Amino acid sequence: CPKLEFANDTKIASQLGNCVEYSLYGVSGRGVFQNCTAVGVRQQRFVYDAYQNLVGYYSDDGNYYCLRACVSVPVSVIYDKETKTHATLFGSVACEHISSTMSQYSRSTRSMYGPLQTPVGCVLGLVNSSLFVEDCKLPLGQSLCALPDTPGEMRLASIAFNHPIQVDQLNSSYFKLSIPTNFSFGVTQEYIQTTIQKVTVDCKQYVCNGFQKCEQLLREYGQFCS
Amino acid sequence: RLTTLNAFVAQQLVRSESAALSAQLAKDKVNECVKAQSKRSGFCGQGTHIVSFVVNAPNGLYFMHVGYYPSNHIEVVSAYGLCDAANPTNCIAPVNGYFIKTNNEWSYTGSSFYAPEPITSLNTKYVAPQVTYQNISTNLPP
Amino acid sequence: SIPTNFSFGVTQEYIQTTIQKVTVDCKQYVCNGFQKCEQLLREYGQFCSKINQALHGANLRQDDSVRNLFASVKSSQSSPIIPGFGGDFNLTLLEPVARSAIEDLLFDKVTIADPGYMQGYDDCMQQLICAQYVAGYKVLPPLMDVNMEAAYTSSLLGSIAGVGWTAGLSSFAAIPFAQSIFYRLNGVGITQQVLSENQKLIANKFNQALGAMQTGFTTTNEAFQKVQDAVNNNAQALSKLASELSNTFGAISASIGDIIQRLDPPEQDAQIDRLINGRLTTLNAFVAQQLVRSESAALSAQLAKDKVNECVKAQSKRSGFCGQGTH
Amino acid sequence: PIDVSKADGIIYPQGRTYSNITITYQGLFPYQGDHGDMYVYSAGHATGTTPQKLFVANYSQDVKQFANGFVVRIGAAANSTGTVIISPSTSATIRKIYPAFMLGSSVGNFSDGKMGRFFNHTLVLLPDGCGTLLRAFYCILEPRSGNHCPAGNSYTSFATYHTPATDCSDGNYNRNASLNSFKEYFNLRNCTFMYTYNITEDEILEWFGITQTAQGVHLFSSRYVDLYGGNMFQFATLPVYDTIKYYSIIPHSIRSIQSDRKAWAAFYVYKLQPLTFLLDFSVDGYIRRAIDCG
Amino acid sequence: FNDLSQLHCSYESFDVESGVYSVSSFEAKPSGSVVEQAEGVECDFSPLLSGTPPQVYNFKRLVFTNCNYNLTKLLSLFSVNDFTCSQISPAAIASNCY
Ligand SMILES: *[C@@H]1O[C@H](CO)[C@@H](O[C@@H]2O[C@H](CO)[C@@H](O[C@@H]3O[C@H](CO)[C@@H](O)[C@H](O[C@H]4O[C@H](CO)[C@@H](O)[C@H](O)[C@@H]4O)[C@@H]3O)[C@H](O)[C@H]2NC(C)=O)[C@H](O)[C@H]1NC(C)=O
Ligand SMILES: *[C@@H]1O[C@H](CO)[C@@H](O[C@@H]2O[C@H](CO)[C@@H](O)[C@H](O)[C@H]2NC(C)=O)[C@H](O)[C@H]1NC(C)=O
Ligand SMILES: *[C@@H]1O[C@H](CO)[C@@H](O)[C@H](O)[C@H]1NC(C)=O
Ligand SMILES: *[C@@H]1O[C@H](CO)[C@@H](O)[C@H](O)[C@H]1NC(C)=O
Ligand SMILES: *[C@@H]1O[C@H](CO)[C@@H](O)[C@H](O)[C@H]1NC(C)=O
Ligand SMILES: *[C@@H]1O[C@H](CO)[C@@H](O)[C@H](O)[C@H]1NC(C)=O
Ligand SMILES: *[C@@H]1O[C@H](CO)[C@@H](O)[C@H](O)[C@H]1NC(C)=O
Ligand SMILES: *[C@@H]1O[C@H](CO)[C@@H](O)[C@H](O)[C@H]1NC(C)=O
Ligand SMILES: *[C@@H]1O[C@H](CO)[C@@H](O)[C@H](O)[C@H]1NC(C)=O
Ligand SMILES: *[C@@H]1O[C@H](CO)[C@@H](O)[C@H](O)[C@H]1NC(C)=O
C-alpha cells in the first residue's frame, strides 16, 4: 500500500454500527460491521462463503466481526388512474427512513404525517381507515389495499375476507338446515382461445428483400429457413 | 433476422401446443356441460351450471354460461328419515330434497329452493332403518 | 372374488398451485447504483422494460389464478370450528388452535429458510432472505394473510362435513360428521349393517391411519419429498440470480466498483458491456423459466380446483382420480 | 498410503478460509492411495565407542523431476520401538528425523562419473541442532576433491553425519554441526543468503510442503498452528529467480556409537500435481474431511 | 423526474394502467469508511538505481510483498520517454493496493 495519513475514525471500533466502506489493503467494499464470536482460522483473517461473499473478519484488536452489506429498503409505488393518486411503499421495514439518505434521482412532492407502519413495512401516502374491501383492484400485498376517494390520500383499508354464513353444529337427531329462498341467473362469460392466427413467412423476401449479393449469401445459411 | 425467426418459431410452436391443448379443453367443455349437463362443480360455470351458448371468436370460441346463484338462505328444521312406531323397519329418505318441519308438520322441499310441498311417494324412496331417525305417530305420510 | 378384510389408505398428494412471486429491478442487479454503469445501461434500455412487464404480467396472472381458485373454493356457507368435532374421530391435527396443528407439523418440518417479513432488516442487524440487495430482488408478500389461508381451510373443513350428502351447491347441510362418514361409506358399496355394529372399529382404523400419516412425516412420504422439491426449486431459482454476480463472463473481476477503480473508461466500457449482456441474458432465461413455471402452476391450480371440487367437495366416482383405489 | 477420506496431508487454501461448508478447489494435490517415495535414515558403523565408516544409500546417484512440488510426512514411525537398519536383529526406540533437501535445474555426473552432480546455483534446506534449526539457502555448492570427497578419489556418495553424544546434549548444538558436516564434504560460494529458522521438538506426526510458483518458492508447515491436526499453511516464500526442475535428498547418517544406538523414523515423500478436490471445512476452519475427483 | 416518469416510460403511453408497481429503489448514503490493517515497512527502491540495468536477456527483477511505497520520490527523477500500462490505467497504478 502507499503511505497513508491514517485517520482516527477509520478503526472498526471507531465506526461500529453504521455501514461504511472497508479498504483492507486491497480488499475493498462496503457493509456493516457487527460483533461476532470467533469462527474459522484466525491466521487467514479473511473468510468468504460458498457464494464467495466475505462474511467475517478477524480485526487486529483481537475481536471478530461479521458483515452483510449496506442494506437499505426496496421501494415500490401504488397509483390509481383517473384520480391522480400515488403513494410510496417500503418493504418489510421499520418506518425509519425519510428523504435524507438518497440515491438515483429526486422524489415527488406531497401535500400533508409522513410514514405509517404496516405488516409489509412502511407506507407514505396513506392513513388508517377501518373499512374492509373484498374486491380490491390494486392489492398492496399481504392484506392491505388503498381505496381512492370518489382528491388526496387514499384509504388504507384491509382486505376483507368473505366469511361465509356460519352454521350451527347441531348434535341432536334434528338438524338446522340452510336453504335458499331466492335465486338469480348469472351470465358468466367465458372464452377459450382455440387456434392462433396461422402465419407463414418466406425466407428470402423477409431476410433479403431481393438483393443479389444477399441472395448468394443466403444459401450458406440456407436450409435453416427451409 | 434468423435469430428473430427462430425465436418466433419457438414461440409459435409453444403457442400451437397451447392452442392444441386448449382446443382439446374447449372441445371437452362443449362436450360435457353443453351437449349435456356436467354435474361436476364449476367446470364451466360457478354454482350449478344450468345452460350455455357458444359463439365464435376471431381466434377462439366464446362461451356464455347461465348458472344458478342463490341468496337469502334461511335456517329450517330438518331430519333424515321417518320410521313408523308400529313399523320401525319401513323408513323413507328424500331423493334430491329435504324433509322440513314447516313453519306453516313435516313436508318436502327440493334441494335447490325453499319450496315446501306435501310429501308423497314420488319424491322419496323406501330405505332401511338406521338409528338417529325420527319416529312419528300422529300423521304418517302415505 | 370378494374382499373380506380391509383398512384405510392415507394417500398423500400435493399440487404446486402457485410458485412464489418474485420481483427484481434490472437497474439494481445489473448496475448497483454506479453512475457510468447507469450511463451505459441506457442503450439497451427497453430490455429492462420488457423484463419488468413480463415478470409483472406473470405475477399478475399468478395472482388472478390464486383469486379465481380461492373464490371458487370458497364455500358460500360453512360452519365454525369447535373442539369435540368428529367426537369419536380423534381429529386433533385438523383443528386450528391462528393456524392449524397439521399445518404446523407440515410447515415446521419443511426445511424453510428465514422469512424476515418484518424484522428482515433487523435480522441483518441481528447476526438467505436477509440478502435483499445481495439477493438483489424483492420477495413479494403473499396475496392473503396466512390467517386468511387458515380461514380458507377453515371454511373448507366446515364445508366438507356437510356438502357430501347432496348433489348441487345450492344449500348447506352440515350434519354431524360421523353420520356423514357413514352415508359416504354407504355410497361406495358398504351396507349400513356393518357400519351399525362396527363404528368403533372403523373409527380406530381411521385414527390409526391418521396417526400413521401424522407420524410418517419423513422421507417415506413422496409428497413430503415433492414439497421439499418445490422448495428447492425456489431455492435454485433464487440462487441462480445470487451466484451469477460472481460470473464475470470473461471480465477481469466481478466487483464493478473495483472494475471502475482499476481500469480506464474506454476498455471498462467493453467490460461492463460484456457483464450486462451476460446479466440481461440470464434474466431473460429467468423470465422464461418462471413463465413456464407460471403456466405450469396455472394448470396445476386448475387441476387442484377440480380435485377439491370433485373428490373433496364430493365423493368422486372416478377410478382413482385422487384416491389410490377408491376414494 | 495417503487417504483423503481420513484427510491426510491436504494443503490448506492459501488465503481464503471458510466455515462449516464444502467447496470445490482446483489446486495442487496428490492422488488417492499413493505409495509415495518413503525413505528412512540410519546411523553409521560403530564398534563400542568408535565413529566408523558411514551407512547410507545411493540417493545421490538418483534424481527425480521436481514436477509441481511435493510434501513430506514426518514422524509416522515414532512413539514406538522399531528395527535397526544396520543391525536388523536389534530394535531400538524410534526417534523422528528431519531430512535435508537440495534442489536445482542443471545436473551432471560426479567425478567418478556417477550421475548427480548439480550445476551452478542451487538451494539447500537443512535441519540442524538435533532437529531444532532449519538453515536454508540458495547459493553455489562446491564439492570437495580430496579423499572420499565428491570431486575426489575413493568417492561413492556424500552424507551429513550427526554426532549425538556431542550435538544432542542439552543446549550446546556445536554451532550447527550438521552444516559443518555437509561442509566437511562441500563448501559454499556466491551466496544469496543463509536463512535461519527455529522449531521445537516433539514425537507427534507432522507434514511439510514444498512448491514453486512465479513469485517464489513456497514453504508450508503445520508446526506453526496445527500441531494436533496437520494441514499445510505457508510460512515462507523464498525469492527465487527462475523455476526449478530437479530435486534430490542430501543423504544423512548419525555417528551413533554401537553401545547406544537409536532407531529412526521413516519419512514419506508424495509428489503433487494439479487436480480438483472438494473440501469440507468445519466450524473451526480446520480441514478434517476432503474428497478426490480423479 | 419522479416515479410516474419511469412508470409512463415502461408502457409507451401517457395513459397507464393503475397498480402496485415495483420501482427502482434507492440507496442510503455511506456513513464513512474504515481503513484498518497492520502495515509493514517501506520496500526500498534504491537497488533499481544502484548498478547498471542489465541486458534484455538478463533483466533483474525486484519482488515486493508486504511493504509500502511512495512513488513521489522516483518518477519525477526519471527522464521517462515512454510511460504505458497494459491491462491497467497508467495514472492510478500508485493508487490501488495489491
Ligand atoms: C505420540 O506421542 C504424543 C506425545 O508427544 C501423543 O500426543 C498426545 O495426543 C493426544 C491425542 O491427540 C493429545 O490429546 C489431545 O488433547 C487436546 C487438549 O489438550 C485435545 O484438543 C485433542 O483433541 C484434538 O484431536 C481431535 C481428534 O483426535 C480433534 O477432533 C480435536 O478437534 C482436537 O484437534 C486431543 O484430545 C495429547 O494432548 C497429546 N499429548 C502430548 C504431550 O502432546 C500421541 O498420542 C502419540 N501417538 C501418536 C499416534 O501420535
Ligand atoms: C453446520 O452445518 C450442519 C449441517 O446442516 C448443521 O447441523 C445441522 O443443524 C440442524 C439444526 O438443528 C439439525 O437439524 C441438523 O440435523 C444438523 N445436521 C448435521 C449434519 O449436523 C450445523 O448446525 C452447522 N453449524 C454451524 C455453526 O453453522
Ligand atoms: C463482542 O461480544 C463478546 C461476547 O460478549 C465480548 O466478549 C466482546 O468484548 C465484544 N466485543 C467488543 C469489541 O467489546
Ligand atoms: C387503526 O386504528 C385502530 C383503532 O384505532 C387500531 O386498532 C389499528 O391498529 C390502527 N391501524 C393502524 C395501521 O394505525
Ligand atoms: C329475489 O330478488 C329479486 C331482486 O333482489 C326480487 O325482485 C325478487 O322479488 C326476489 N324474490 C323472492 C322470492 O324473494
Ligand atoms: C325412534 O328413533 C330412534 C332413533 O333412530 C330409533 O332407534 C327408534 O327405533 C325410533 N322408535 C320407533 C318406534 O320407531
Ligand atoms: C385385517 O388385517 C389387519 C392387518 O392385516 C389386521 O390387523 C386386522 O385384524 C384384520 N381384520 C380382520 C377382521 O381380520
Ligand atoms: C388424539 O391425537 C393426539 C395427537 O397426538 C393425542 O395427543 C391425543 O391423545 C389423541 N386422543 C385420543 C382420544 O386418541
Ligand atoms: C550452470 O552451471 C554450468 C556448470 O558448468 C555453467 O556452465 C552455466 O553457466 C550455469 N548457468 C548459469 C545460468 O550460470
Ligand atoms: C561471485 O561473485 C563475484 C563478485 O560479484 C564475481 O566476480 C564472481 O565471478 C562470482 N562467481 C560466480 C561463480 O558466479
From TrEMBL, chain B:
Disulfide bonds: C33-C44, C83-C91
Residues of this chain annotated as glycosylated in UniProt: N103, N135
UniProt protein name: Spike protein S2'
Positions spanned in the full protein: 1074 to 1220 of 1353
